[PDB]
Design a protein around this ligand. Structure first.
Ligand code: SAH
Ligand code: ZN
Lengths: 112, 300, 176, 76, 366, 179
């Protein structure tokens, strides 16, 4: 009968905690589920999403585009060092690669 | 303005380099460059002994809060520990590469500051004896460094107008008071309230700089100081007396309001280069350059 | 007959009407190629809005000046300050006369009868002070160091708002 | 019943109320005349807490008395 | 005392900054009134004092053979009081280090404290029996009467002003006593959990006001205001200003103290050696700290006027302050190190414009 | 030594930065790299005591031939204020450091700037610059020429038309002039 403070705003987050608690009861991951785990896990997922979307937005401005197309995501992951180690064996669709040419495949000049 | 001449203290073959009192106000060492420091008193010229054992010429001696620790800032580019009640040197603080001009002690008896001409101010431990930190300070040989009221600030001048304020613990500079003209700011010192810092320049203009804003609009003129690092002081037992030395054989004392000549006390025979105020009496040490060699004490 | 194409600061807000401009971030002394050599010619400067810290220097300058340089440097140009009425010309500081307000109908008149000059500050057709005398060789362009973002508007037509009292000039709609 | 509520800040405030009112009436009156957030209207009856879920007549205080409010954050 | 023009966005401690690798086997720590010294007890019964501004070791005093596990400073900063398993009411000088009082009285002591204004009244907290207040010259000892006598674990202290004596048993019943006449003016049992009571480990106070802390044993630090106890009086039922706990690791605490301004609360683990810092007002964690990952924490201090924090682990006393960043314009204030294209046109008094002291201040004042 | 009359005191202007330990070693599209530049220009370079002339800009990170090094940024002036600021800086006894971008404006470095003032001159350079567009506001970006190792004091050529002041830097195959 009291105020329906949802567990998102009662925590101070943006990811839902009801959907996370449903997908931890109904995944057959354990018998009993605590009441700190879905909150903590919602926070972790939010922080990783914020971490990649910051760099995505920076690259999206810096190529002079409004939206974000996945080429920016490929550049934003593979330019960073720790996110590339996280996304180790991952192929983003429509991704492309970093521009990389070796050191000996391009000519050099000596005379005059 | 009734400080009359009373005594005469001599006995040094080179120039009497500096005369600074003990901070308790009971002693006054005659550090002269002739490798002789006669341990004089402070009330009549009370000779105790002559402490020597140096290597080259003496430039400056410092004083600590116990009035026992003395350090030799001799021309041997080192600093040696000289306790009064020892008669026995303990350590020698090697590490400079040029001559040592000025040195001081903290107000709580456990720091040593040094000065070297090659633009690197070194910080020294007292008891365990180690070069603590090194400061790439100036463009010039070191003129004057000074601890504040307790040991948090270090003011520093130069030969081209760089009144720099330094931190004790972090060991980086904090504030640089600069004038567009460059009179060589020979001698600087604090004030007991921690709000004012004195300066001495080679243009016949003596200023007590404010600490925060850094200005002085009541400035002194009309005196004689254009070639040397004449020491200036503060008399503590009268009123607002501003003590300094002279070049024309005089003892300069003034009041804050005056900005003129009110009192030029005669008696010496050379450029008065080193004075100190006895911190518990109306006694002012006074010794001039090489053509005097006769330290003359004063009394109201 | 519009504002200048060649003789303008290119960063100005010369809009599609080419009569009203918003001031830029410097002493943007915009000139105009519709300037006088000799004769009897006068227009108005229908200034409308002038925000604070948007000064304006009024005078007549010669075509060999700089677009970014403020008015009143040498014999090319004669300047004057809004606040306190302090003209500055040939590196001289002289607190001279009374200033102006905000968004009045300005515009000065100069006359060269065929060597001698008529240099008077005209604020709504009122004598406000004689600035200088005996101008030298050259064409004379309207140069105003628009200081910051202000609303000024040059007037061209014969429907003059504050014409000078009993002063004769050919109208400025007969040159372009 | 004109109660006095002098807090620990010299902030005396008066409400001429009925002896048979609830806590919500006092919350509405203080929130009207001062805008004080009603999660801090804790009152004290001889040391013990006056709980904010009952009526005024459940404690039988002498009429037109003086109480004391505590500046409290409850829902932050 | 320090620089006033220094505050270029001052901070709250982040770094490790370097420690005292001089003498190990530390046991407890406490600062003086201003935050200029730090007494530290050894393992064999000695005192280590470290001065802060010079960053120098001040004085080493060898007290006794029993390990020193309780310390306090006087108001002037001249009388150290301490007690240990040596059973002795001690009192020490800071210029000399003298055995001024020596009274081996049994049930060895767990905490001492001065009255915060008069240094004549000192606190004594026995091994079992009720806490004792003493004088300096004569042996006038005041044991506070306890209705329980069953815990044999009673904690008590004086607050910021020394107005009253807050006492606490190991059953969680508080008996407020007046500081001289022992007036039982207020009493409350702590509302622990649903119903079941808990023990009380320690109680400390502030430097500004009457907000204070309760360190229970159900892993819940509680924050009350002493004026609420005064407003209650007898048979009080206080509910706290702010409750504190960390249920992720379920960590019982070892030591707490407040900030200098009474704004921030530090509290330390008994398990992980990881310090936490809270806001008093809005009520959340702001920062976790760490250290040597497998050591056992003993005692945490705080510096009042300046954000410096002292820890104790494996006899090593850490000092954590910002690893502060130095830059230009202190060597040359006429030049300031910018970053990008800064425009300079806002002043209008350019292009060749030419226009048309008396304060007597003392020099040897305070 | 105080009775000695050492007068090395004041023969130059007021400024210093000397006596530092100036011996470290003996040895993509455009705006993303502009972000990279604003990131790493602090950790890349360093100003220390040169043996060439006073001070100079060293190098610490091993630079590949082509990357950005630093942005030479300061106050922004136009073409009028040059002679006025030069007369003021000559009146106070201050060296004047300026750099023209293009046919529009000049970036100052005297009263406000960065750690990029302090590159000396040579005629065998290893740095240059171009013109870019970070949203209309153009900039002054230090590229590179060859693989620069650690400890080298950095240099670049000034593109002077050959037009007084002699060569007080001493390069190897220099024309004994800046112009
Ligand atoms: N090798 C050199 N010796 C002296 N001046 C030089 C020089 N090369 C260039 N210059 C001139 O001097 C300026 C170099 S900036 C000098 C570095 C730094 N300001 C310092 O004081 O050490 C430039 O304006 C340039 O015009
Ligand atoms: Zn050259």
């Amino acid at each position: 009968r009291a105020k329906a403070k949802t567990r998102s705003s009662r925590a101070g987050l943006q990811f839902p905690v009801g959907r996370v608690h449903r997908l931890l009861r109904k995944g057959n991951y354990a018998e009993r589920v605590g009441a700190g785990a879905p909150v903590y896990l919602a926070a972790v997922l939010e922080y990783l999403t914020a971490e990649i979307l910051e760099l995505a937005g920076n690259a999206a401005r810096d190529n002079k585009k409004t939206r974000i197309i996945p080429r920016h995501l490929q550049l934003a992951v593979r330019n960073d060092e720790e996110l590339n180690k996280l996304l180790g064996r991952v192929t983003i669709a429509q991704g492309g690669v970093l521009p990389n040419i070796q050191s000996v495949l391009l000519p050099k000049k000596t005379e005059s | 303005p009734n400080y009359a001449l009373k005594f005469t203290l001599a006995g040094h073959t080179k120039a009497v380099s500096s005369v600074k009192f003990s901070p308790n106000g009971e002693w006054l060492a005659s550090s002269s460059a002739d490798k002789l420091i006669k341990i004089w008193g402070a009330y009549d010229g009370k000779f105790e002994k002559t402490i020597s054992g140096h290597k080259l010429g003496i430039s400056d001696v410092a004083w600590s809060s116990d009035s026992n620790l003395l350090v030799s800032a001799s021309d041997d580019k080192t600093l040696k520990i000289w306790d009064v009640s020892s008669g026995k040197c303990l350590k020698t603080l090697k590490g400079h590469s040029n001559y040592v001009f000025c040195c001081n002690f903290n107000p709580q008896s456990n720091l040593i500051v040094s000065g070297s001409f090659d633009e690197s101010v070194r910080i020294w431990d007292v008891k365990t004896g180690k070069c603590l930190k090194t400061l790439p300070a100036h463009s010039d040989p070191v003129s004057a460094v000074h601890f504040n009221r307790d040991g948090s600030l270090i003011v520093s001048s130069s030969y081209d107008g760089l009144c720099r304020i330094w931190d004790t613990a972090s060991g980086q500079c904090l504030k640089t008071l600069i004038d567009d003209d460059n009179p060589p700011v020979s001698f600087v010192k604090f004030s007991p309230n921690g709000k004012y810092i004195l300066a001495a320049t080679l243009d016949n203009t003596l200023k007590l700089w404010d600490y925060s804003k850094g200005k002085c609009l009541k400035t002194y003129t009309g005196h004689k100081n254009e070639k040397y690092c004449i020491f200036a002081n503060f008399s503590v037992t009268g009123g607002k007396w501003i003590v300094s030395g002279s070049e024309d054989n005089l003892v300069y004392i003034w009041n804050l309001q005056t900005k003129e000549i009110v009192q030029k006390l005669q008696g010496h025979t050379d450029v008065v280069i080193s004075t100190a105020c006895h911190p518990t009496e109306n006694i002012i040490a006074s010794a001039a350059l090489e053509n005097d060699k006769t330290i003359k004490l004063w009394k109201s | 007959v519009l504002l200048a194409l060649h003789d303008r600061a290119p960063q100005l807000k010369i809009s599609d009407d080419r009569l009203t401009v918003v001031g830029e971030k410097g002493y943007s002394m915009v000139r105009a190629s519709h300037g006088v050599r000799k004769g009897a010619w006068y227009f108005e400067i229908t200034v409308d809005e002038m925000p604070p810290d948007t000064a304006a220097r009024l005078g007549w300058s010669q075509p060999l000046g700089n677009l970014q340089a403020p008015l009143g440097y040498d014999k090319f140009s004669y300047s004057w300050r809004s606040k306190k009425g302090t003209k500055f010309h040939q590196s001289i500081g002289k607190h001279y006369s009374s200033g102006y307000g905000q968004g009045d109908v300005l515009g000065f008149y100069i006359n060269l009868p065929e060597p001698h000059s008529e240099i008077i500050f005209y604020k709504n057709g009122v004598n406000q002070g004689v600035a200088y005398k005996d101008i030298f060789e050259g064409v004379y362009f309207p140069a105003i160091s628009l200081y910051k973002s202000c609303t000024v508007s040059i007037n061209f037509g014969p429907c003059f708002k504050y014409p000078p009292k009993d002063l004769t000039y050919r109208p400025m709609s007969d040159m372009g | 019943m004109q109660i006095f509520v002098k807090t620990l800040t010299g902030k005396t405030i008066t409400l001429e109320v009925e002896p048979s009112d609830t806590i919500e009436n006092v919350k509405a009156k203080i929130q009207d005349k001062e805008g004080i957030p009603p999660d801090q209207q804790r009152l004290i009856f001889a040391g013990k807490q006056l709980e904010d879920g009952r009526t005024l007549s459940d404690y039988n205080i002498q009429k037109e008395s003086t109480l004391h409010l505590v500046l409290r954050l409850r829902g932050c | 005392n320090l620089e006033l023009l220094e505050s270029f966005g001052q901070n709250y401690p982040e770094e490790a900054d370097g420690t005292l690798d001089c003498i190990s086997m530390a046991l407890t720590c406490t600062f003086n009134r201003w935050g200029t010294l730090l007494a530290v007890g050894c393992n064999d019964g000695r005192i280590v004092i470290w001065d802060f501004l010079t960053r120098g070791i001040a004085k080493i005093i060898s007290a006794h053979i029993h390990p020193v596990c309780s310390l306090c400073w006087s108001r002037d900063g001249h009388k150290l009081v301490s007690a240990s398993t040596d059973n002795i009411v001690s009192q020490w000088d800071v210029l000399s280090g003298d055995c001024d009082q020596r009274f081996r009285f049994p049930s060895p002591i767990l905490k001492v404290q001065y009255h915060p204004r008069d240094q004549n009244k000192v606190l004594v907290c026995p091994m079992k029996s009720a806490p004792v207040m003493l004088t300096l010259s004569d042996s006038k000892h005041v044991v506070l009467p306890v209705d329980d006598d069953s815990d044999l674990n009673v904690v008590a202290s004086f607050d910021r002003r020394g107005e009253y004596i807050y006492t606490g048993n190991a059953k969680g019943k508080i008996l407020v006593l007046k500081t001289d006449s022992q007036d039982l003016v207020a009493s409350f049992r702590v509302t622990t959990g649903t119903s079941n009571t808990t023990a009380i480990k320690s109680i400390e106070f502030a430097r500004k006001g009457s907000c204070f802390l309760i360190n229970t044993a159900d892993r819940i630090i509680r924050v009350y205001d002493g004026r609420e106890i005064l407003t209650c009086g007898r048979d009080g039922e206080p509910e706290p200003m702010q409750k504190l706990q960390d249920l992720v690791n379920r960590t019982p605490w070892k030591k707490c103290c407040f900030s200098g301004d009474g704004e921030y609360i530090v509290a330390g683990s008994a398990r992980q050696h990881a310090l936490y810092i809270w806001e008093k007002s809005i009520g959340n964690l702001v920062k976790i700290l760490h250290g040597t990952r497998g050591e056992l924490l003993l005692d945490v201090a705080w510096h009042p006027v300046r954000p410096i924090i002292a820890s104790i682990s494996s006899g090593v006393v850490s000092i954590w302050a910002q690893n502060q960043v130095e830059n230009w314009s202190a060597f040359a204030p006429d030049f300031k190190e910018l970053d990008e294209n800064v425009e300079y046109e806002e002043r209008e008094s350019e292009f060749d414009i030419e226009d048309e002291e008396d304060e007597e201040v003392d020099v040897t004042s305070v | 030594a105080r009775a000695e009359v050492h007068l090395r005191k004041s023969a130059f202007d007021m400024f210093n930065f000397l006596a530092s330990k100036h011996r470290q070693p003996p040895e993509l599209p455009m705006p993303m790299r502009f972000r990279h530049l604003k990131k790493t220009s602090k950790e890349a370079v360093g100003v220390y005591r040169s043996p060439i002339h006073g001070r100079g800009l060293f190098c610490k990170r091993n630079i590949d031939a082509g990357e950005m090094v630093i942005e030479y940024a300061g106050n922004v002036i136009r073409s009028i204020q040059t002679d006025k600021r030069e007369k003021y800086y000559d009146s106070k006894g201050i060296g004047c450091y300026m750099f023209r971008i293009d046919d529009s404006e000049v970036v100052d470095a005297t009263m406000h700037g960065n750690a990029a003032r302090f590159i000396n001159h040579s005629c065998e350079p290893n740095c240059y610059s171009r013109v870019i567009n970070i949203d209309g506001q153009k900039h002054i970006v230090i590229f590179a020429m060859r693989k620069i190792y650690r400890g080298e004091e950095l240099t670049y050529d000034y593109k002077f038309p050959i037009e007084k002041l002699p060569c007080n830097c001493g390069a190897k195959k220099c024309r004994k002039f800046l112009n």
